[PDB]
Amino acid sequence: TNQWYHGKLDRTIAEERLRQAGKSGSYLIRESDRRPGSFVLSFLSQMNVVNHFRIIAMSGDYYIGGRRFSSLSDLIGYYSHVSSLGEKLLYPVAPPEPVED
C-alpha cells in the first residue's frame, strides 16, 4: 500500500525514477525539497514529458487543481479511481528496494 511515497526527493532523481518505470501514467509523490511542507505529484506523461504538479498542504488539507483532500493518500486515490487530472494515474512507482548487502 502507498508504495508511491518517496519522501524527500529532488526533481532530477524523481524524473530518473519515473523514466526508469518508462510508461505514461507512472507517478510518485515526493515532499518538495525546494518547498518543504509542500508536495509534488511527479507524473510521466506522453512523449517523454514528466510533469511536476504542486500539491498544497492547507489547514490539514491537501490542494491540487482547486480540489481539496484530507490526505496525500486520498489525493492519489481520487486521480486514480474517480477522475482523470485529462491524464490518468496508472502505475505507482515504488522507491528502489534496499540493495543486496
Q: Domain spans of the chain? A: 1-101
E strand or H helix at 63 = strand 61-64
* C-alpha cell recorded at residue 72: 496525500
CA distance 69 to 75: 6
User: If one looks up domain 1-101 in CATH, what number appears?
Assistant: 3.30.505.10
Pairing of strands 61-64, 67-69: antiparallel
| Percent of the chain as helix, strand, coil, to the nearest 5 | 25, 35, 45
Task: Tell me the C-alpha distance between 62 and 39, whole Å.
Answer: 9
The structure was resolved to a resolution in Å of 1.7
What is the enclosing helix (H) or strand (E) of 15?
helix 11-21
The answer to whether 95 and 6 are in contact (CB under 8 A) is yes
Residue of 47, 83, 46 lying closest to 65 (CA atoms): 83
Which residues are paired to 67 by β-bridges?
64
